[PDB]
Scaffold this active site. Structure first.
Site, PDB file in Angstrom:
ATOM      1  N   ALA B 246       0.830  -1.192   0.000  1.00 54.02           N
ATOM      2  CA  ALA B 246       0.000   0.000   0.000  1.00 54.02           C
ATOM      3  C   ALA B 246       0.868   1.245   0.000  1.00 54.02           C
ATOM      4  CB  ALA B 246      -0.920   0.012   1.219  1.00 54.02           C
ATOM      5  N   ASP B 247       0.499   2.216  -0.823  1.00 55.48           N
ATOM      6  CA  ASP B 247       1.045   3.556  -0.696  1.00 55.48           C
ATOM      7  C   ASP B 247       0.365   4.179   0.514  1.00 55.48           C
ATOM      8  OD1 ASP B 247       2.546   5.934  -1.987  1.00 55.48           O
ATOM      9  OD2 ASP B 247       0.534   6.741  -1.634  1.00 55.48           O
ATOM     10  N   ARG B 248      -0.949   3.984   0.582  1.00 56.52           N
ATOM     11  CA  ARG B 248      -1.758   4.534   1.659  1.00 56.52           C
ATOM     12  C   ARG B 248      -3.012   3.722   1.911  1.00 56.52           C
ATOM     13  NH1 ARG B 248      -2.746  10.865   2.426  1.00 56.52           N
ATOM     14  NH2 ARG B 248      -0.542  10.741   1.807  1.00 56.52           N
ATOM     15  N   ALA B 256      -4.943   2.881  -1.504  1.00 53.73           N
ATOM     16  CA  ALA B 256      -4.330   3.467  -2.669  1.00 53.73           C
ATOM     17  C   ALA B 256      -2.997   2.777  -2.832  1.00 53.73           C
ATOM     18  CB  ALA B 256      -4.145   4.959  -2.482  1.00 53.73           C
ATOM     19  N   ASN B 257      -2.684   2.396  -4.059  1.00 52.46           N
ATOM     20  CA  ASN B 257      -1.484   1.619  -4.299  1.00 52.46           C
ATOM     21  C   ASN B 257      -1.136   1.664  -5.757  1.00 52.46           C
ATOM     22  OD1 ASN B 257       0.575  -0.133  -3.131  1.00 52.46           O
ATOM     23  ND2 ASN B 257      -0.331  -1.791  -4.354  1.00 52.46           N
TER      24      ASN B 257
END
Lengths: 356, 353
Positions: B246-248, B256-257
Site C-alpha cells: 500500500a502507498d496509503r 491506494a497503491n
C-alpha cells in the site's frame, strides 16, 4: 483510406510493418516470391491480410502473363504458386483456405467446355480481386453492425460512447478497416464516439505500436494506457463499452484472443459494461465445442523479458509467456460481431451455418 | 535475507538500485551529505529505507565525534542535518517524519537535568538503531502473521500455496524483508510456498526489475508475468492468494497503491481468491475516511511511451499515466496485514485510533 494493402490491376503494394510506427512506407510486391519473402519477414501482418497479399501477388504475375504457355501448364502454374504461398506462414488457415478456392476456381474453369488459357488466367485474377473486396466489405459490415448494436445497447436515444480496445484489430491486422477497430471507425464516422481507449498489450505491444498509430492517423480522439490501468479507466474515465477482436471463436462462443482479453472481460463485468468480440465467421471455428480444446501458444520467455534487444527483467527469473487467453462466453455480454450480424454466444453456431 | 541496507555501528553501506538488476554493488556512506546525494541519485528507493539511510548516515557521523562541541551545538547539528536530509527527496514524507521525532529525541534528551554532550550523542545513535530494528521486526511480523492467516484461510488442511504479488514491496522498497514480499518470504521459510507470481508492473517495471531480482536472490520458486496475464494465471496456474502493498490506507480500509492493484482485486474476486493488503500501520492514514479523499497523481506520458530511452508507442497518441488506483475495501477479502496482525477493513479504525 488507411491501407496496409494497395492493389490495382497489375499493381500491388504493401505497408511495411517492420518500419512502423516511426515510419509509414510502402513496398512494391512484384512477384509471388516477393510476397513470400515479405510475409516471412513479417512486413505483412494479420492472417487475412497475409492471405490476400499472397493471392494478389499471383494475380500480378498472371496479369503480367506469367504461367503457361498452354493451359494445363497454367493450372499447374497457379497450383504451384499457391502451395508455395501456403509454405510462407502456416500459422493459420486463411492462406490454405484461399488457395483451395482459387485452385478449385481454376480447375472448374479449366474443366469447363471450351476452356482456354486466357479464360482461366482472367478468372483466377477476378476471383482474387473478389476476395479483396469481400474482406473489405465484410470488415465494414462488422464495424457498422457492431457500432449499431452497441449504440442500441449503450446510448440508444443518441449520445456518444467511450470505447476501450485491446491489441491491434484495425487496418494493420486486416485487408483494411479492421474488426474491433472497424467498430470504432464506424462510431466515429457516425459522430457518436466520444473517446477511444487502447491498451499497450504487452509483451508484443501491438496496441501501443499499431492501434495508437491508426487512431492518430484517423484523427480519432484516443488515449493509450497500460494493460494494468484498464480497471481504473473503466472506473474513472467513463468507458461505456469494450470491443475486442478474436484469434479464434469456438462453437459455444468461447474466444481465444491476445492475452489480457479475458482479464478485460472480467473487469468489464465488474463495472457493468458490455463486452463485445468482433470477428468474421471465417474466424469462428465450429469444430471445437469449448475453449478447453484450444492449445494456448506459449512463446519464449526472452520475448517477455527483453525489449528492443535489451533485457529489462531480472536475470534468472522464471517466465510464463502465453500469447493468448480464452474468454468464457458468459462474459461476452455485448455479443459476437460478425459480417452476418451480432450474435449472443448460444446463437452463434446455428446462425453461422444457416444464414446468408 | 537480502539487504539494501547494511548497517553496523560506525559502518553504513547501501545497495545501488541504479545498477540492479544486472549488478549488485555496495557503496559506503560515511557522511550525511553522501546519503543526501545517493538519495537524490535514487540509489536508495522506498520511503522507509530513504529515511533510515539518512538517519543512519547522521548516526555514522555522530559516531565520528562529528557535531558539537558542547551540547546545544550538537542538537543544532542534529537538527540541521535532519532538516538538510529532508531537502534531497521530499515526495516521501517518511524522512520528514523521522527528522521531527529524532529532533524531538535530541531535544527531549538535551532537556534533562545533568545533561551531557555524550548522552545526547549516543542516545541519538541508539534511537536511530532502534528505528532500524523496529522497521525490520515490524516487517517480519507483517510477513509471519500475514502468512499464518493466509494459510489458515486458504490451506487449513496443510498443503502449499501459490501467491501472486504486484510492484516491489521487499528489501528493495523497505529497510528489509519487506511487507507483501515479506509474507511470501515467510510462506517460504515455513516450507508452505509452492510458487510466487510477480507482475511486470508497468510502466516503471518494479516487479520485472526488483521483485524478480529479490525472488531469484532468495531462491524462491517464482515466475514473472505481464500485468495483462493475471487473470489467466489465476484461472490456469493455481494462484490461491493475492498479497499487495500500500502507498496509503485510509480509515475504512480503502487502499491506494501502485496502479493495477484495483484490477488485481477485481480479478481475484472473480476467481474467488482472497485479496490481501500488507501495510505497516504507519502507512495507514486515519485522517481520511474514504478512498474518495485520495488524490491520484498523474505522471508524465513519456514515462509510459518510452522504455529505456526509446519510444515504443506510436507518435502523437494521447496518454493517461496515473501512478495509483484505489481499491475499495469491499474487495479486500483476505484482510489488511499490519505489524499487529490481519484486520478486516471495518476493524481497522478502532485497532489504530
Amino acid at each position: 483510406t488507411l491501407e496496409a494493402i494497395r492493389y490495382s490491376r497489375g499493381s500491388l503494394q504493401i505497408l511495411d510493418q517492420l518500419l512502423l510506427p516511426k515510419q509509414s512506407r510502402y513496398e512494391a510486391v512484384g512477384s509471388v516470391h516477393q510476397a513470400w519473402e515479405a510475409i516471412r519477414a513479417m512486413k505483412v501482418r494479420g492472417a487475412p491480410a497475409i492471405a490476400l497479399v499472397g493471392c494478389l501477388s499471383l494475380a500480378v504475375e498472371l496479369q503480367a502473363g506469367a504461367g503457361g504457355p498452354g493451359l494445363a501448364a497454367l493450372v499447374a502454374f497457379v497450383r504451384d504458386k499457391l502451395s508455395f504461398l501456403v509454405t510462407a506462414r502456416p500459422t493459420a488457415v486463411n492462406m490454405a483456405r484461399a488457395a483451395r478456392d482459387l485452385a478449385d476456381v481454376a480447375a472448374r474453369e479449366a474443366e469447363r467446355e471450351g476452356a482456354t488459357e486466357e479464360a482461366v488466367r482472367e478468372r483466377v485474377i477476378c476471383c482474387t480481386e473478389d476476395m479483396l473486396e469481400k474482406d473489405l466489405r465484410d470488415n465494414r459490415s462488422i464495424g457498422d453492425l457492431g457500432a449499431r448494436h452497441l449504440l442500441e445497447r449503450v446510448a440508444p436515444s443518441g449520445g456518444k460512447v467511450t470505447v476501450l480496445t485491446h491489441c491491434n484489430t484495425g487496418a494493420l491486422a486486416t485487408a483494411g478497416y479492421g474488426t474491433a477497430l472497424g467498430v470504432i471507425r464506424s462510431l466515429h464516422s457516425l459522430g457518436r464516439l466520444e473517446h477511444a481507449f487502447c491498451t499497450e498489450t504487452r509483451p508484443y505491444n501491438q496496441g501501443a505500436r499499431l492501434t495508437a498509430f491508426e487512431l492518430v492517423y484517423e484523427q480519432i480522439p484516443a488515449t493509450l494506457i497500460t494493460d494494468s490501468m484498464v480497471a481504473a479507466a473503466m472506473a474513472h474515465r467513463g468507458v461505456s463499452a469494450v470491443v475486442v477482436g478474436a484469434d479464434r471463436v469456438v462453437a459455444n462462443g468461447d474466444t481465444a484472443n491476445k492475452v489480457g482479453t479475458y482479464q478485460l472481460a472480467i473487469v468489464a463485468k465488474h463495472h457493468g459494461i458490455p463486452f463485445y468480440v468482433a470477428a468474421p465467421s471465417s474466424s469462428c471455428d465450429l469444430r471445437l465445442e469449448t475453449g478447453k480444446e484450444i492449445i494456448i501458444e506459449e512463446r519464449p520467455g526472452q520475448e517477455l523479458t527483453d525489449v528492443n534487444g535489451v533485457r529489462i527483467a531480472a536475470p534468472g527469473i522464471g517466465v510464463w509467456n502465453p500469447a493468448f487467453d480464452v474468454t468464457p462466453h458468459d462474459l461476452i455480454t455485448g455479443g459476437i460481431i460478425t459480417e452476418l450480424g451480432v450474435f449472443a454466444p448460444e446463437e452463434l453456431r446455428t446462425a453461422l451455418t444457416t444464414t446468408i
